[PDB]
Amino acid sequence: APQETLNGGITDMLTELANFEKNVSQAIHKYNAYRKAASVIAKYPHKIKSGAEAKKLPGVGTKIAEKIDEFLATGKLRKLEKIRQDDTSSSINFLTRVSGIGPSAARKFVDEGIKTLEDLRKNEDKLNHHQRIGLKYFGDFEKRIPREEMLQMQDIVLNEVKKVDSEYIATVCGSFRRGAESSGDMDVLLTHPSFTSESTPKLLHQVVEQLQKVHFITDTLSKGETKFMGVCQLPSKNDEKEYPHRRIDIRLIPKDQYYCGVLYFTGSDIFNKNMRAHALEKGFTINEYTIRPLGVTGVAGEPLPVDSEKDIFDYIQWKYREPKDRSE
DNA sequence: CCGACATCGCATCAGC
DNA sequence: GCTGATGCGG
DNA sequence: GTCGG
Ligand code: NA
Ligand code: NA
Ligand code: NA
Ligand code: NA
Q1: Which of the 117-136 residues on chain A come under 7 Å of nucleic strand B at their beta carbon?
Q2: From the Cβ of A134, is strand C under 7 Å away?
Q3: CA A249 – CA A221 distance, rounded (Å)
Q4: For the domain that residue A96 is a member of, what is the CATH number?
Q5: Positions of chain breaks in chain A, given as the residue before each break (C to N > 2.5 Å)
Q6: Where does the chain bind dCTP?
Q7: Are both A159 and A254 inside the same structural domain?
Q8: Which of A4, A45, A188, A289 has the highest CB neighbour count under 10 A?
Q9: With b meaning 16 or more CB within 10 Å and e meaning fewer, what string describes A159-180?
Q10: Exposed, middle or buried, A200 (CB in 10 Å: 0-12/13-18/19+)?
Q11: What is the CATH number of the domain that holds A237?
Q12: In Å, what is the CA distance from A153 to each residue of A109, A145, A158, A160, A172?
């Protein structure tokens, strides 16, 4: 991809606008509009010279073209400069960086005078469990995870899962599975031959419990019968700086829907969009759970049997593609 | 013009 | 107390 | 905010 030096000024501007839409104005669709614009621009191999030039790109409309014209001629955007200095808005926007604190909680906090982590620290009683954890690890959670650490994390997860029951099947998905050099968190998909879409409730708990027993999992954000969201940390060596705490999610999925799950959670997002498109034009409907045939009138039929990622590709006459080649 | 922009598990709130 | 809505995250 | 039926 082109160096940020090309249109970084523009993409940074659009991303900042995106955050305020989401966190302050609570306009999620505008947040995504701005993100989409930033992405299409971020991949444009030419230094943009005008809003008109950018408008030709899908996702960039009249308004963003105008803002780009203003940024190119002045080196800034008045509305953004203004919002940045706004003490209330900048505080609301900031607080949402705490996991567990969304637009609603952030606005409530600021309305009562709680505007900083310091203020949050002084008001533990007004934070729920999730938020306290997000605060506790505010810094760690914003750090990325090197692939080498992800490999050490995977070693632990796979080992402990097999130790609980050798029949469990666990797959670390996400960009990591596509071979990325760094990850933002760890996403683990878990299944067991004993759990199917039509056949019975503690399969997840036993794995979470073992990971806690060996002190890999350190905190729990949420945990149910099919989904666990929490925190983990690699063991540190003597006299060695401790590793940052990391976010890890573990999902229990029915065996017959496992590979549709692995495919989906491996992505990338652009690849899934494409594959779902091709699958459609081929007469199939693919979601994170199953792949079903589409009748003449568009009536989806029963889900087709899947025993591997390949089965999916085969159904839609597509050559199986390696995770490292699913960038798009 | 004006609706879509994904959908759902879990924690917690709001209403009865 | 139970049931549905909301907030949040992914 | 952008797209498109
Ligand atoms: Na455009
Ligand atoms: Na956030
Ligand atoms: Na947050
Ligand atoms: Na065994």
Answers
A1: 128-130
A2: yes
A3: 10
A4: 1.10.150.20
A5: 200
A6: 144, 175, 178, 184-185
A7: yes
A8: A188
A9: ebbeebeeebbbbbbbbbbbeb
A10: exposed
A11: 3.30.460.10
A12: 36, 10, 9, 11, 10
Tell me the nt nearest to A102, Cα to C1'. Answer: C8
As a rounded value in angstroms, the CA-to-C1' distance for A89 and B2 is 30
How many domains are contained in chain A?
A: 4
What is the C-alpha to C-alpha distance for residues A61 and A54, in angstroms, rounded to an integer? 8
CA A30, A31, A32, A38 torsion-angle sign: positive
Q: Beta-carbon neighbour count of residue A57 at 10 Å?
A: 18
A34 alpha carbon – ligand 3 mean position (Å): 19
Residues A248 and A276 in one domain: no
For residues A152 and A240, membership in a common domain is answered with yes
In DSSP terms, which residues pair with A251 in a beta bridge? Answer: A189, A227
The answer on A217 and A259 residing in a single domain is: yes
Resolution (A): 2.0
Are A45 and A111 contained in the same domain? no
- For residue A249, say whether its CB is under 7 Å from any atom of strand C: yes
DSSP state of A235: P
Amino acid at residue number A87: D
- The domain spanning residue A36 has which CATH number? 1.10.150.110
Question: How many other β-carbons are positioned within 10 Å of the β-carbon of residue A235?
Answer: 12
Co-location of A148 and A250 in the same domain: yes
Rounded CA–C1' distance between A179 and B13, in angstroms: 41
Range of the domain at A95: 87-143
Task: Tell me the CATH number at A300.
Answer: 3.30.210.10
Q: Are residues A82 and A92 part of one domain?
A: no
Q: Ligand 4 centre and the CA of A167: distance in Å? A: 6
What percentage of chain A's residues is helix, strand, coil (to nearest 5)?
50, 15, 35
Nearest residue to A204 (alpha-carbon basis) of A226, A187, A221: A226
Query: Based on the domain organization, do A15 and A124 belong to the same domain?
Result: no
